[PDB]
């Protein structure tokens, strides 16, 4: 079957290399002088990046106001605070300095700053953005690829909901990616980032078989590179080369260069979002737990996709085995690989038992059946949740 | 390595997507210059489809026909004049890489009060350009999604590449059906070209590029799997689709992030085609294996990795140089198996090797994997006789 008709468009300027925070003045010159600096819980102050950014913004002659304390799984209360700061200070441009939570929050602020309503209306697709403030990023954690896409995931902590939204208007104008700026990412979140970029590859790879041989190999190649790099990096967290490789693969994993011509599945991500909506756990910690059990649950729909991963990525020999046997062996080896890094493999790792599984499944089903490789209903989610206990 | 990646082109891919022209043209002006080549788009029926879409879009169409393979700068200057004559707002390139590259030179030339050859020779750096889009009819160059252009001066016998951030296509429409009528020889050439572009980006000394290496090796493997089937089934949608898709990725910059390509074989090829006007990738098939052999000693590990990962060479009991040389033979055998030439004699080409070497050396020493001088290119040309 022909690949799906597609449109690829990604206008983000990706700036990569050591010391490239010094590109900020040149990149800021064409935009207005009122800048909102958005950042998280303080790791950029301890790494020294905060003072470097402040120095560059001073050099750029801009008036700086700040939104500090964006939380992991950024909250819409934080977004609305940022929108208010944009209104209060008549902000022209936003600079996101942090991880995916900071970038995702900044996208929601940029769109929320052109909308006279609750920013949660944008997250829930009640209002489709027609304008947005421009923004850029300095990335401090390799994981989500948000530095080079137009998507954003926001939590409503009052309603215990976590949803992804997107807009062609909230691509970053530029993103500055220096491996040195990820050196202080702790081991646990270094592991999470690698789980996340691998999971993004899986999401884009699990589609019905069609004429995507080069896309398949780009996906398999990214997985092999991360698998080769991850054990070395976790034991050598200040290694420039190892951080560089993972920073690079994190961007390609979700900038759209892998998803041309094929609809991703994204069901495991939606289930994970429901778990993090209730318990606030790290996104990719939930992915490491859930993805292998989604793969087991959906295998009968077509074992051929997982079989190809099992053979090309996970070293399974297929001689004398059915496709289902090969695929199941591969899923075990994926789960073993993540566990060998120290990633969690059961919900009990986050002190999550079965008390709220019905609530979590309901939240996953809030928009009806979902998934493109297999359509999932409440019984399916529930089965995947129970297997992940 | 430090790098900057930026590519704002909207890539529109799929069957029947020429019908996207009205929506994509809506935000631009109504004076469109349609640029195309020697008439193959009329023989395919594509010309009439485009005219129908431009009529649907309500635009005033003027035409520049007859852009030649290895587009000549005289055609560019005529195109600039047509832009001034008819107050053109937007250019639509409908053809191959020659047509798109010519259209890029017209788009920039239309904002410069002088000969566009100044732009090709980098005497004038474009400060503005007209916007343009493309409908691609041949899978080869990747010009549909980059900011580069290669223009020939047929009076001086020169062929040079130039570029500008201002001449990315606004959009490019890629329908595999529009490559169905590409004849066997140019189908072969396109696949040789895209593989060569991968080789150019792969032969560098930048240390830490493991994923780029695999993206390159993956593209080569995909083309190798597809090419023998396609040359015997030229109207197969699936096979044309794969080659159209890999052709764009091979030179849209998605493979060269963090690594400066070598590009020496291309510069030597450009000198050959400047004198003899042969197909770009016909020269590449002849030259590239001998460039690979000539530069092997600089670092046998690069070609060795290609030999093992792409060309199925078993390394047990062999030196890196032995593995690499086996890989080069298999690359050359593969291209020959498609019908690509393997010697300069295939194009009735040693009387003009000194001239070709001079033109290749016109900008001094070149090459990133190995720095080449006149003696080097002369040796590669002779090995290619
Ligand atoms: N995708 C979505 O994006 C979000 C996940 O984004 P993410 O995986 O990039 O992680 P994140 O939620 O943006 O940050 C995870 C943790 O990493 C810390 N951090 C970030 N960069 C650091 C650095 N250079 N050095 C030390 N600590 C650093 C952060 O602490 P600080 O807050 O103190 O910076 C934070 O606690 C989720 O909401 C997901 O759904
Ligand atoms: N890169 C650079 O780009 C140029 C090479 O570009 P290229 O390899 O893409 O080839 P090209 O030079 O743009 O065209 C090569 C030949 O293929 C014909 N052609 C294009 N599309 C066709 C189609 N759908 N059906 C039948 N024939 C078709 C052209 O004939 P027509 O002129 O009649 O269209 C031309 O004669 C070189 O200058 C190279 O340096
Ligand atoms: Ni994710
Ligand atoms: Ni080429």
Residue numbers in the entry:
A (entry chain A): -1 to 387
B (entry chain B): 2 to 350, 352 to 387
Paper's wording?
To address the specific interaction of YugJ with NADP(H), we determined the crystal structures of YugJ in complex with NADP in two crystal forms. The first crystal structure (space group P1) contains both the NADP cofactor and Ni2+ ion and was named YugJNADP-Ni. However, in the YugJNADP-Ni structure, the nicotinamide ring of NADP is disordered, and only the remaining NADP region was built. However, in the YugJNADP-Ni structure, the nicotinamide-YugJ interaction is not observed because of nicotinamide disorder. On the other hand, in the nitrate-less YugJNADP-Ni structure, the nicotinamide ring of NADP is disordered, although similar conformations are observed for the YugJ Asp102, Asn147, and Gly149 residues that interact with nicotinamide in the YugJNADP-NO3 structure. Thus, we propose that NADP(H) nicotinamide in YugJ prefers high structural dynamics for substrate recognition and becomes rigid upon substrate binding. Each protomer of the NADP-bound YugJ structures (YugJNADP-Ni chains A, B, C, and D and YugJNADP-NO3 chains A and B) adopts a closed conformation with a smaller interdomain angle, similar to that of YugJNi chain B. However, NADP binding restricts the interdomain organization of YugJ into the closed conformation. In contrast, the α9–α10 loop of the YugJNi and YugJNADP-Ni structures adopts an open conformation that increases the accessibly of the active site. Accordingly, an additional three-pointed density was not observed in the YugJNi or YugJNADP-Ni structure obtained in the absence of nitrate.
